[PDB]
Design a protein around this ligand. Sequence first.
Ligand SMILES: *[C@@H]1O[C@H](CO)[C@@H](O[C@@H]2O[C@H](CO)[C@@H](O[C@@H]3O[C@H](CO)[C@@H](O)[C@H](O[C@H]4O[C@H](CO)[C@@H](O)[C@H](O)[C@@H]4O)[C@@H]3O)[C@H](O)[C@H]2NC(C)=O)[C@H](O)[C@H]1NC(C)=O
Ligand SMILES: *[C@@H]1O[C@H](CO)[C@@H](O[C@@H]2O[C@H](CO)[C@@H](O[C@@H]3O[C@H](CO)[C@@H](O)[C@H](O[C@H]4O[C@H](CO)[C@@H](O)[C@H](O)[C@@H]4O)[C@@H]3O)[C@H](O)[C@H]2NC(C)=O)[C@H](O)[C@H]1NC(C)=O
Ligand SMILES: *[C@@H]1O[C@H](CO)[C@@H](O[C@@H]2O[C@H](CO)[C@@H](O[C@@H]3O[C@H](CO)[C@@H](O)[C@H](O[C@H]4O[C@H](CO)[C@@H](O)[C@H](O)[C@@H]4O)[C@@H]3O)[C@H](O)[C@H]2NC(C)=O)[C@H](O)[C@H]1NC(C)=O
Ligand SMILES: *[C@@H]1O[C@H](CO)[C@@H](O[C@@H]2O[C@H](CO)[C@@H](O[C@@H]3O[C@H](CO)[C@@H](O)[C@H](O[C@H]4O[C@H](CO)[C@@H](O)[C@H](O)[C@@H]4O)[C@@H]3O)[C@H](O)[C@H]2NC(C)=O)[C@H](O)[C@H]1NC(C)=O
Ligand SMILES: *[C@@H]1O[C@H](CO)[C@@H](O[C@@H]2O[C@H](CO)[C@@H](O)[C@H](O)[C@H]2NC(C)=O)[C@H](O)[C@H]1NC(C)=O
Ligand SMILES: *[C@@H]1O[C@H](CO)[C@@H](O[C@@H]2O[C@H](CO)[C@@H](O)[C@H](O)[C@H]2NC(C)=O)[C@H](O)[C@H]1NC(C)=O
Ligand SMILES: *[C@@H]1O[C@H](CO)[C@@H](O[C@@H]2O[C@H](CO)[C@@H](O)[C@H](O)[C@H]2NC(C)=O)[C@H](O)[C@H]1NC(C)=O
Ligand SMILES: *[C@@H]1O[C@H](CO)[C@@H](O[C@@H]2O[C@H](CO)[C@@H](O)[C@H](O)[C@H]2NC(C)=O)[C@H](O)[C@H]1NC(C)=O
Ligand SMILES: CCC(CC)O[C@@H]1C=C(C(=O)O)C[C@H](N)[C@H]1NC(C)=O
Ligand SMILES: CCC(CC)O[C@@H]1C=C(C(=O)O)C[C@H](N)[C@H]1NC(C)=O
Ligand SMILES: CCC(CC)O[C@@H]1C=C(C(=O)O)C[C@H](N)[C@H]1NC(C)=O
Ligand SMILES: CCC(CC)O[C@@H]1C=C(C(=O)O)C[C@H](N)[C@H]1NC(C)=O
Ligand SMILES: [Ca+2]
Ligand SMILES: [Ca+2]
Ligand SMILES: [Ca+2]
Ligand SMILES: [Ca+2]
Lengths: 388, 388, 388, 388
Amino acid sequence: VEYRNWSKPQCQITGFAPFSKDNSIRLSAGGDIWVTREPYVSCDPGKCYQFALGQGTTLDNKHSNGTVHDRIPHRTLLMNELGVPFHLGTRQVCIAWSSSSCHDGKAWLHVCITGDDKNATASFIYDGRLVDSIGSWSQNILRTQESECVCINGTCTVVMTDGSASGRADTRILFIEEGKIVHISPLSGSAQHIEECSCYPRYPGVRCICRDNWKGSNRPVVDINMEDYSIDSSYVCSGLVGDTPRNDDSSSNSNCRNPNNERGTQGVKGWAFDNGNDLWMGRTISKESRSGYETFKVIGGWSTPNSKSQVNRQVIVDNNNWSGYSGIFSVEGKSCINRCFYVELIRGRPQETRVWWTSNSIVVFCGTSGTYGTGSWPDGANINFMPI
Amino acid sequence: VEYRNWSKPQCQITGFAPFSKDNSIRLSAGGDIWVTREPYVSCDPGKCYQFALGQGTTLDNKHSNGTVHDRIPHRTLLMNELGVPFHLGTRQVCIAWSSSSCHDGKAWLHVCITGDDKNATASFIYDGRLVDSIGSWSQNILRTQESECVCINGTCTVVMTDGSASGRADTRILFIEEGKIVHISPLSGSAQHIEECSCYPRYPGVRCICRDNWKGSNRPVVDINMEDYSIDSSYVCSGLVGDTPRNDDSSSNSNCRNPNNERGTQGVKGWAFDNGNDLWMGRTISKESRSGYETFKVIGGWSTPNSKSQVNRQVIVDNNNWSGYSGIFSVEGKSCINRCFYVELIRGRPQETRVWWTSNSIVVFCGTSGTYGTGSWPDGANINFMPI
Amino acid sequence: VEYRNWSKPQCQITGFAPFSKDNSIRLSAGGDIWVTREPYVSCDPGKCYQFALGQGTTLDNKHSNGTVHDRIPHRTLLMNELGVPFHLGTRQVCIAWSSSSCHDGKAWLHVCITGDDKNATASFIYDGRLVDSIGSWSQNILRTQESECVCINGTCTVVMTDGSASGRADTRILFIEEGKIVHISPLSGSAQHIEECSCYPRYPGVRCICRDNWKGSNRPVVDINMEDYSIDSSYVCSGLVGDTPRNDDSSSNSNCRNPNNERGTQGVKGWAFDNGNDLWMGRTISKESRSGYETFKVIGGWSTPNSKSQVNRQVIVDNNNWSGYSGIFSVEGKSCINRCFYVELIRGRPQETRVWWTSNSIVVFCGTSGTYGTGSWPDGANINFMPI
Amino acid sequence: VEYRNWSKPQCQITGFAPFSKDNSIRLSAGGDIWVTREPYVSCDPGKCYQFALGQGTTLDNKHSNGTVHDRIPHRTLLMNELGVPFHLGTRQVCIAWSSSSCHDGKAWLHVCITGDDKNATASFIYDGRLVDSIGSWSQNILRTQESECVCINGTCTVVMTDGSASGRADTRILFIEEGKIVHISPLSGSAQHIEECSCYPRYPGVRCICRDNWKGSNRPVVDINMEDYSIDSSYVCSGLVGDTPRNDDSSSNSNCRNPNNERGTQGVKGWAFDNGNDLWMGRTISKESRSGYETFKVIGGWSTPNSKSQVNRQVIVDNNNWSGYSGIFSVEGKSCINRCFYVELIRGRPQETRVWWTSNSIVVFCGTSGTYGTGSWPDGANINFMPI
Ligand SMILES: *[C@@H]1O[C@H](CO)[C@@H](O[C@@H]2O[C@H](CO)[C@@H](O[C@@H]3O[C@H](CO)[C@@H](O)[C@H](O[C@H]4O[C@H](CO)[C@@H](O)[C@H](O)[C@@H]4O)[C@@H]3O)[C@H](O)[C@H]2NC(C)=O)[C@H](O)[C@H]1NC(C)=O
Ligand SMILES: *[C@@H]1O[C@H](CO)[C@@H](O[C@@H]2O[C@H](CO)[C@@H](O[C@@H]3O[C@H](CO)[C@@H](O)[C@H](O[C@H]4O[C@H](CO)[C@@H](O)[C@H](O)[C@@H]4O)[C@@H]3O)[C@H](O)[C@H]2NC(C)=O)[C@H](O)[C@H]1NC(C)=O
Ligand SMILES: *[C@@H]1O[C@H](CO)[C@@H](O[C@@H]2O[C@H](CO)[C@@H](O[C@@H]3O[C@H](CO)[C@@H](O)[C@H](O[C@H]4O[C@H](CO)[C@@H](O)[C@H](O)[C@@H]4O)[C@@H]3O)[C@H](O)[C@H]2NC(C)=O)[C@H](O)[C@H]1NC(C)=O
Ligand SMILES: *[C@@H]1O[C@H](CO)[C@@H](O[C@@H]2O[C@H](CO)[C@@H](O[C@@H]3O[C@H](CO)[C@@H](O)[C@H](O[C@H]4O[C@H](CO)[C@@H](O)[C@H](O)[C@@H]4O)[C@@H]3O)[C@H](O)[C@H]2NC(C)=O)[C@H](O)[C@H]1NC(C)=O
Ligand SMILES: *[C@@H]1O[C@H](CO)[C@@H](O[C@@H]2O[C@H](CO)[C@@H](O)[C@H](O)[C@H]2NC(C)=O)[C@H](O)[C@H]1NC(C)=O
Ligand SMILES: *[C@@H]1O[C@H](CO)[C@@H](O[C@@H]2O[C@H](CO)[C@@H](O)[C@H](O)[C@H]2NC(C)=O)[C@H](O)[C@H]1NC(C)=O
Ligand SMILES: *[C@@H]1O[C@H](CO)[C@@H](O[C@@H]2O[C@H](CO)[C@@H](O)[C@H](O)[C@H]2NC(C)=O)[C@H](O)[C@H]1NC(C)=O
Ligand SMILES: *[C@@H]1O[C@H](CO)[C@@H](O[C@@H]2O[C@H](CO)[C@@H](O)[C@H](O)[C@H]2NC(C)=O)[C@H](O)[C@H]1NC(C)=O
Ligand SMILES: CCC(CC)O[C@@H]1C=C(C(=O)O)C[C@H](N)[C@H]1NC(C)=O
Ligand SMILES: CCC(CC)O[C@@H]1C=C(C(=O)O)C[C@H](N)[C@H]1NC(C)=O
Ligand SMILES: CCC(CC)O[C@@H]1C=C(C(=O)O)C[C@H](N)[C@H]1NC(C)=O
Ligand SMILES: CCC(CC)O[C@@H]1C=C(C(=O)O)C[C@H](N)[C@H]1NC(C)=O
Ligand SMILES: [Ca+2]
Ligand SMILES: [Ca+2]
Ligand SMILES: [Ca+2]
Ligand SMILES: [Ca+2]
């Protein structure tokens, strides 16, 4: 077994093809299934796994009540093979109300954060054993990506924030070797707020498209140099912006450098990736709510400030259905590195008040160099059929 | 580990022996079990797996209502070890309302089709990663075998159709290497409608017995040359015909070349294979409905137009019990390739209206060179005991 | 991987120590657990497995009603790791209302019998594929051991009967190489009725202690020569007899050669094994009913007709609790071959009529060369707590 | 694979970081989950497992009633991967109402005790087979650690007691090679009552901190010489004592040599380990009841009689929540041996009488050389939501 380097070109793609779906909520109405949120996907060199933050309860369970709330001590990181829904034999990998995981070619790293808001602990578990930990540096909800971290030549990197969710905060980039923090770099460059980064290998570095929860409806970028630990940051050029909320397409803007101050407050975890001057990205279809999900390529979306010319759109979830978080994961093929993504499909609170819980299912698509058609792959549960 | 060649002679058989049965529907009345249809079996070089298309729900579950419907976004391909029923720990391999899977000696290939009727997408997943995709070429429900594909020396072939289910359609034969489509051949020969092929290795090529849903109650054949990608097609010679509906045995015909125009419209997935001039086949016992199941050898059934002399009959399911689809799968032995088959045992709608769902169990038999007796192995559930 | 020879001396033991217990019926009252009977245990070179004949249903399931009946097409052979109860993820290895399984050092053989009483089929599955089959030779419930078969140097042997359960029948001993029947020997010697043999390796041969369901409350012996396929048979010498029903200890007899004609009709599967002139054996505590279970060594119990001197008794299940079948299995240690045994603990019908099902749990003990105390390890379920 | 030696230095730690939590009781209100108590954790060289003693029943199950009782024949040792809750697919490793397990680098050893109070049997299962057994030597509830044993160079040691729980008893130290007892050493030194030892490797020997249930609220120590089998014993020097019940910190004493005769009778399983002259320990926060849990380092707590200066305290469970047993386990790192611990979180009887069962969940922490914050990780179930 060898370390992953991801030293292959990115796969040239034409769009995305359907890959997985777990039907969690449909199943929860006739089965013992975990209440979750903040899912993601990551693969070792052989196979893929779905992850999510449990709420220490199943859905058909009185403990499901009140699970809209983000942080309790009972939240743990669930990890199954992709497509295996979160049944009672699911392994709870660690204690976490925020997490990130990645495989370095040899073993799994999990970054797991739990404890008091003002004084949380992040544990670093590598190859099944606790190797390191770090306490909160700003005493205000230490937190991380809620998607996969990225490792090159045995060094994994992960982005963490501590501080205000609606103002300047303290963001740092950790470099981790076999679970041991070997270096920490502060955020640097022009991004002014970093949450929930969706990162991906871009040899010889790592690149993240994140969420600005303060002043930007355009998505921040963080670039991580794995050779000298230097950090840069900016914003996605595309004038078709990825965050929710956001201005409609005719009145939205980005200059690649600063937050746009267009319905900038709040956000949703998301992703995009560069292809030369172009940008593949996803976002919700609704500009104000976490409804629908669409992908497309923005021509000049990486290089050209305020580009709004798109091509190769695909509906993933139609705008009559709830979406939520989305993130990227990368998969090594024979000659190139492919990009895939997942979409969290949130059911229950706050939008659907018939029930007293909040949970999600997922749908997963991968990059393709072939052809495809159309469809819509929503959660599929009838809210009226669910235990409340 | 090496690529399968299947370069051994076909096992000489005297009939078939009982192999597996999952009791899905009986279990569903006291357990959380997936609603399914369109099952099949395929084995890697070590062990066998059962597959089926889930309906994104369990049976004792209000989402079971309306599962007679064929195509929804929530259908996924389930894969367990043969004999493990579809419990909540079952892995959803991909998104699929039509599928085919096969193992090439090294890894699994799954062909999974989902999306809009008029614009579907087929994903090609090999060794746990999406390698290729293709969109609909006739904008009318792109679809495939619902049984195993076949691979020789690293090339796997699968048969797909797009177009009318009651008229001329567009059928193509794909050749796939490690998930990557390397060549596509149009249907050629005298078969005029091809659905749901049951294929098997017949070194150096592959042979399929399929379903003609337009003008034939006799079963089409498709022969696939793996060396030059050429295709040929015809119909099963036997005057004892395998489709349902069909004429009774006294007024049924086949000339090996054309659809017989005898109750030709509609059909059911099925199988047969050749042994020299003779034919082993199965079919429903009823000639109008999907009731019962029987196998037999037809003397001259492969080489002689309209042969009706059978021998070595076996009841698999008696005619008081519901059957459904059936397909072949091949298992490599020490010195020969054996042929096995599965029968889908459909319960619920449209035949049984006490319940509002449609699901199935399976029963599985393998060729034997030994001896055997008699029996009947139906689904076994009491419809009156089921959740509605 | 090499073939097992079992060419080590038998472990000298002082009694038996507790090994496993599955609590199936206690669990069935709050969980989805298979209805079973006819359990047994067998181990490959690394680990042990429990087996049982399912009834194609869980206990808390209306299909549980009527499961006192022995043979339906829905019965299949369940196989889990020992101590894993029969939950919904249990693999159904084959179709069987009677079975035997063993591992030859390389792979598992399963002998599975199903179909019509008058014309049953036995399938032989080796290394996950059907290799052979045989039909009924006397048209009267072809049947086998309901415990492990035994393999030496790649040849597995198994004892099967076809014919009357209350009169002379047709018993044959099969020799099976990688699932292929290479030879069949008729029963020979003085045993006049053979059912449900508990066999064990006794290098260079195999020895079985079985059940006489016609004229003997003493247990028949069958000796199998694996070098030339010759068969011998007799009866256990011990005047403390192993079958149920039987005469009380003061009025019971055996002469090592003929059935004793003492409450000979009926029986229960059981076991014993020789140690020089002595005999270790188990039986129910009740002489008339399947209640309690006890083991002991009978001094001269193998060599001396009608010996009644016992030593080293142990209660396994007290006589206030239901037992059932019991059988032997052998486990290779570093220098010797150990003998273990299981006891089936039957709950429900016919004895307990509050419920309409019949099922069992198991308890398992292994030979020890150390010391031990006392106890009683019954099923433990409160019949009044069970779904009916 | 090689025998563990544990010949690395103890990891220098600053405290403990969150590692795992199973949420057993919360899940039990919407799922079929085993009733347990007496949990622990032990890891093979690759991964960690949670263990516990089942009560032969699930919680939502009428057999849960009366599970406050300690010893029944239906108790079995459960073993899952750490983080997998005790669902119906959990393996019952052996019959046990008291146990200890450990992995010697090659295979697992389980020590399992069951049977009559006055005449119990301990089985020694190694590598999936029963290798040895021993009967009770004092006819008064033979019993062992309820946490992991320790193996160095192929010899595993475990501490057992037989005799009064409120008076002088007979304690012995067994040395076991591949399941076989090779030597037994009587307790020696100044410890006067030894229960439920929490042992750890301290190369070249093993050290245990145990429970004195007769006259000590301070914790006994047992030191085991693996080279010559000699034993020594004493008490933990720290004047901050670890047992419950105990005197408050102002009136508590220990002289390192004798039980302190301060609320000495009764107790609770616990742990501590030395680092030079200092002591890391945990205990309940309440001094009279099994409520809360806290850890801290005591400066001079190992070497200095009656030291009461603590540093680096951490709340694990706050004093509004129920705790219970706790024990140590050791995890080998790249360059040092780390110490982790688990806390049993007892719910139901005797403290919570709304329900008629007694069960537990766990929370697990591992030593860290990094930093951390604060929190509280209790069981988390609402007793009012539970099945009674
Ligand atoms: C069958 O499926 C195929 C593949 O999905 C599908 O082809 C795709 O159609 C879409 C929609 O036309 C194309 O994406 C568009 O590209 C144009 C540039 O030529 C853009 O202008 C579009 O964006 C505008 O329109 C969108 C609405 O469609 C708005 O949401 C958006 O804000 C813009 O105003 C859009 O990006 C896509 O390129 C093709 N894909 C390929 C590979 O050709 C085809 O249409 C389907 N057939 C049928 C009959 O439905
Ligand atoms: C015990 O089991 C064995 C094995 O199953 C069984 O032997 C089989 O019997 C069947 C039925 O007789 C044989 O199959 C027949 O073969 C003749 C040709 O010799 C055909 O004519 C038969 O077809 C006609 O009859 C069918 C009804 O049986 C009709 O459905 C059909 O349309 C035809 O008109 C049929 O193919 C078979 O060959 C044997 N198998 C062997 C290996 O001998 C035996 O009968 C069983 N005995 C009992 C008492 O159950
Ligand atoms: C603690 O446990 C140990 C180990 O189990 C136990 O020692 C065993 O006691 C039994 C019962 O006495 C012994 O078995 C007996 O052996 C004598 C020969 O000396 C036989 O005569 C006995 O058979 C007769 O009695 C039985 C009732 O006990 C009848 O059921 C039977 O039909 C006969 O009439 C019986 O075989 C056994 O040998 C010892 N085992 C050892 C290793 O010594 C001990 O008794 C237990 N201690 C207490 C206080 O319970
Ligand atoms: C954020 O988290 C960190 C890490 O947990 C935390 O720092 C820790 O605080 C505790 C409490 O002050 C420190 O532990 C104490 O150490 C002093 C000696 O310097 C002892 O006197 C303390 O014991 C006394 O007080 C206890 C109550 O706190 C009593 O229970 C006890 O009986 C004694 O009278 C105690 O051991 C600990 O050393 C630090 N850890 C580190 C690494 O600095 C910090 O306080 C947290 N901040 C907030 C705002 O939550
Ligand atoms: C879920 O919990 C909520 C909050 O505790 C419950 O809602 C409360 O119900 C009480 C009881 O009548 C009311 O008096 C409160 O005003 C409600 N609170 C709120 C915020 O609405 C609710 O009943 C629980 N639901 C279920 C299904 O158990
Ligand atoms: C399954 O779904 C069907 C269709 O929705 C339900 O049948 C309908 O029930 C409504 C009232 O609830 C009637 O007004 C319609 O006439 C019914 N439709 C048909 C076509 O019969 C049915 O109730 C559902 N079944 C269950 C068990 O919930
Ligand atoms: C289990 O099945 C049995 C047999 O079908 C049922 O017993 C019968 O019940 C009917 C209905 O009242 C009676 O008329 C018959 O006389 C009963 N038969 C016998 C043999 O006693 C029984 O009710 C079913 N039990 C359950 C729990 O479903
Ligand atoms: C759990 O078991 C207890 C003890 O059997 C039950 O309490 C007894 O109930 C009976 C009547 O059913 C009373 O006469 C006794 O006085 C009760 N005993 C005690 C000690 O209180 C209790 O009902 C059972 N609990 C449940 C939930 O079934
Ligand atoms: C605490 C700040 C943070 C980033 C904006 O809030 C997130 C947003 C929430 C989201 O907008 O739905 C869900 C996340 N569970 C939450 N993360 C944590 C650790 O609580
Ligand atoms: C759409 C044509 C096709 C071939 C006849 O219909 C099939 C027949 C159906 C029926 O004959 O049972 C079941 C299949 N689910 C359906 N396949 C799809 C993809 O919908
Ligand atoms: C059919 C004869 C046979 C041996 C006496 O009966 C067995 C006895 C029964 C037993 O006495 O309880 C149970 C077995 N399930 C049955 N075996 C079969 C195949 O039905
Ligand atoms: C029997 C003495 C022993 C040591 C104090 O009691 C333990 C204490 C009990 C209690 O302190 O929680 C729980 C244990 N289940 C019990 N062990 C056994 C084997 O019954
Ligand atoms: Ca924003
Ligand atoms: Ca047709
Ligand atoms: Ca008899
Ligand atoms: Ca004490």
